[PDB]
Curated annotation (Swiss-Prot):
<comment type="similarity">
    <text>Belongs to the RNR ribonuclease family. RNase R subfamily.</text>
</comment>
<comment type="function">
    <text>3'-5' exoribonuclease that releases 5'-nucleoside monophosphates and is involved in maturation of structured RNAs. Involved in degradation of type I toxin-antitoxin system bsrG/SR4 RNAs.</text>
</comment>
<protein>
    <recommendedName>
        <fullName>Ribonuclease R</fullName>
    </recommendedName>
</protein>
RNA sequence: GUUGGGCACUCUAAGGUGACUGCCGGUGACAAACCGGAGGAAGGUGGGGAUGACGUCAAAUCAUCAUGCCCCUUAUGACCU
């Protein structure tokens, strides 16, 4: 429910997400990465500019390499990132036929 | 500890050790790096000091000191109260 601004530093009208009327992106696919004694799945697409906090109870295989879908169990909060889990361990990200299989789960195609 | 009590511990102070990308994951030219993880007292330029290049102001100092040219030289020297 983006609101207008009474300014514009360009040719475009300035929106501002004063509120989110609806949540979409229910789930993301990505590579899981171990950080500072933690986990963080990086979304397949770069359109999500943040990572997804993985707690250990939602690691479920995902190591440095493994591709996994995330049933996002929480979402960003001001400065904080989205939390999640690990769904399907698609396989090591650098595998021939993951490129397809990654897209198979990205789009939410049948199986 | 006051005393007996090796002296352990703390300390005292000489000599060594120790830290680096050395290591293990990512990431990335397989390298470098970057990002984390170990282990360690110490994490990625360990921390404080010390130690620089050519220069300028005819900068300041003839009251630190010395000093050419002067000046004083029974006094501009010197002594006391």
């Amino acid at each position: 429910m983006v609101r207008l601004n009474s300014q514009s530093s360009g040719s475009r009208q300035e929106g501002t997400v004063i509120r989110i009327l609806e949540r979409a992106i229910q789930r993301v696919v990505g590579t899981y990465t171990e950080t500072r004694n933690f986990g963080f799945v990086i979304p397949d697409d770069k359109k999500i500019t943040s990572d997804i906090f993985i707690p250990k109870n939602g690691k479920n295989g995902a190591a440095e390499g493994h591709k996994v879908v995330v049933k996002l169990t929480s979402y960003p909060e001001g400065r904080m990132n989205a939390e999640g889990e690990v769904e399907t361990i698609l396989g090591h990200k650098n595998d021939p036929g993951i490129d397809i299989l990654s897209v198979i789960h990205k789009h939410g195609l049948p199986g």
